[PDB]
């Protein structure tokens, strides 16, 4: 089918050692895996999605400041696209099949217009990558299933801090949601 | 703020010993829990909904039909409310603050007019009890949570097979969704 990744919060502050969320050593596991996977959608023309936790820093309406410190905010370094994602992104910021998009909740699809550039392009399959695996890879992969997507998870592009939950997060997405899990 | 209880899949499908998906003792164990939730919800005046999982085991396009067994089937006693809810559910039914909603996917939300519903009677607060923690309960959760909802999910009134994924499920409610996990 035709497909896109969905490459999600992949920031300094999800990765880095004093990233001010940091998920620790098991994101920056992945860094090599991930940056390979990314890169490889990108040359073979496929749709690519930076889907990017985005704070403003004055925002006490948003849900996330009542559960968390400051992070992921517009400006900072801490936004910024971790390790060697970060030049890859900008080498191909320019092209058509690549779309940086800032979100404001865990799914990749909520408040965006992630469906509409989807169904424009008649994306079928959605491959997801990125942190955390039973976190936004969790809830982007509802809302995909809910919208009838097919689905596949990249299971060494994803990780999380808390071991037993990314554990629990791939199991779900095979027995659950019915996704593809590709090492 | 107005509140509402959204009782999910306590069929005897899912709980029964005997039933097609069954959670087993976990399930049976929150009966009284769950059966003075809802009374207490109903008798009140508060809005409660049933969302139960509707099946036409016959479908193909359903992304269940061959990867899971016949469930919660329209006619079948497999599809009825477990032990003491069914009663309760058939004394109230008729209750203008009772409602019986059928749902095709793990999400309560999910293709369900369960959102027009809560905004017409201005509903802010959403309670959540039922089966299973780490799959209907979660992905009604997710949403009820995109959606903007103040969430409270009773802890001795949700149960699932995997006693793992319940643990994981109620952190994740307290710690992503922000959500009141109340025992
Ligand atoms: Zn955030
Ligand atoms: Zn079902």
Redesign the pocket.
């Known amino acids: 089918m035709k497909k896109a990744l969905i490459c999600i919060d992949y920031t300094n502050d999800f990765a880095a050692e004093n990233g001010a969320l940091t998920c620790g050593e098991p994101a920056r596991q992945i860094e090599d895996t991930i940056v390979s996977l990314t890169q490889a959608f990108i040359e073979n023309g496929d749709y690519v999605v930076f889907a990017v936790?985005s704070?403003d820093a004055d925002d006490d309406f948003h849900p996330?400041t009542r559960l968390?410190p400051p992070?992921?905010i517009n400006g900072t370094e801490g936004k910024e696209l971790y390790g060697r994602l970060s030049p890859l992104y900008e080498k191909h910021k320019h092209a058509k099949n690549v779309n940086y998009m800032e979100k404001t909740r865990y799914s990749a699809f909520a408040g965006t217009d992630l469906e509409l550039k989807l169904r424009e392009r008649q994306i079928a399959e959605l491959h997801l990558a990125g942190l955390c695996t039973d976190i936004c890879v969790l809830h982007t992969a509802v809302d995909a299933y809910n919208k009838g997507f097919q689905i596949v998870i990249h299971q060494n592009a994803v990780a999380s801090f808390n071991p037993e939950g990314h554990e629990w997060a791939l199991s779900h997405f095979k027995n659950s949601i019915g996704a593809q899990v590709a090492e």
């Open positions: 936790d704070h996330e968390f992070h992921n």
